[PDB]
């Protein structure tokens, strides 16, 4: 199988996309938020509002092929437009899976390949984490924040929309 | 190519495109029936485009030929990218003119400081994507092994070399994989990988063709 955006084009290596829920009714795109004690939005969460597209993601792999396939180990990082002062002087905003919580976080202050893959999932797609490969899903904290965590057997179904063009 | 220029028609006659509906890699024509590319560019049923300059245009010297054998190096490691080379056999011999022509394999390895021409239809931005209609070129010095391993600690094998600029701004990029690095008229490298594109102290990394001339010639004779 192959990876397609909402325009039915194969996903580009190094491309930027919004990552939206494949279904609809609950939440919008992926973006950043603060959880717990952190003073700076370092958690990857899903927007609460259905109308919000969130923050676009750069998805790429080190070999310089033009496209992406389910086979490729991926680096994923949020784009850096209009950030809070906290993140304002960082070049990249890479995703990293972090803690005993296995939450997806951005790690601005830091191996050949990345730890993520994109895999088909029913009529859309899912993000998996490869330490082997576990689905990433949503775990809703007690403040209703919709955290992207490692969550095997319960993937969030996503679809990719070009941020440009 | 980021920070390069328009090669122009027929200046890089050995440059080929690898397609499967879309352009995904480039490669290099070494004789009428054989192309060299990257091993991570492998997929079944590759269509090869020769004589291309403008991708939105069907040029007259353009040739569209399907691969009949796509031979990956026996030792290609998808995890380290070591031995990232592939040979493609064209289903029939291509027509050699001024728009389509071969490039020589090297007799010996190129030395650091050698200026090379790297070419591709790959992305021209360092963040987000921008593909060119026309082929893009860049001249880039070959960097020393010491510089190369300082940029990519533990990741540079004996079959890789760095070329480009440590300041940034000029580099190959996504879409350029498999494409030629030509120095002094010999095919000395294959676009392989890097961390991002054109970023500081992160030059492109290229497959060191000179280590594979034997394998190439042997493989051609047996197929």
Author numbering:
A (entry chain A): 1 to 110, 114 to 134, 141 to 174
B (entry chain B): 16 to 34, 37 to 67, 69 to 125, 127 to 130, 132 to 183, 184A, 184 to 187, 188A, ...
Describing publication, verbatim:
The plant protease inhibitor EcTI from Enterobobium contortisiliquum is a classical trypsin inhibitor belonging to the Kunitz family. A Kunitz-type inhibitor that was first isolated from Enterolobium contortisiliquum was named EcTI. It was shown that EcTI inhibits trypsin, chymotrypsin, plasma kallikrein, plasmin, human neutrophil elastase, and Factor XIIa in the stoichiometric ratio 1∶1, but not thrombin, bovine pancreatic elastase, or Factor Xa. The fold of EcTI is a β-trefoil, typical for the STI-related family of Kunitz inhibitors.
Crystal structure of the EcTI-trypsin complex reveals the binding mode of this inhibitor to trypsin, demonstrating the conserved conformation of the reactive loop of the inhibitor docked in the active site of the enzyme. EcTI belongs to the family of substrate-like inhibitors characterized by the presence of a reactive site loop in canonical conformation. Its reactive site adopts a classical noncovalent “lock and key” inhibitory mechanism. The side chain of the P1 residue Arg64 acts exactly like a key inserting into the active site of trypsin. The side chain of the P1 residue, Arg64, is involved in charge-charge interactions with Asp189 in the S1 pocket of trypsin. That highly conserved interaction defines the primary specificity for the recognition of the trypsin-like serine proteases by Kunitz type inhibitors. The whole contact area is 987 Å2 as calculated with the program PISA. Superposition of the structures of the complexed and free EcTI reveals that there is no significant conformational change of the reactive loop upon binding to trypsin. Structural differences are primarily limited to the main chain in the vicinity of the P1 residue Arg64 which occupies the S1 pocket of trypsin.
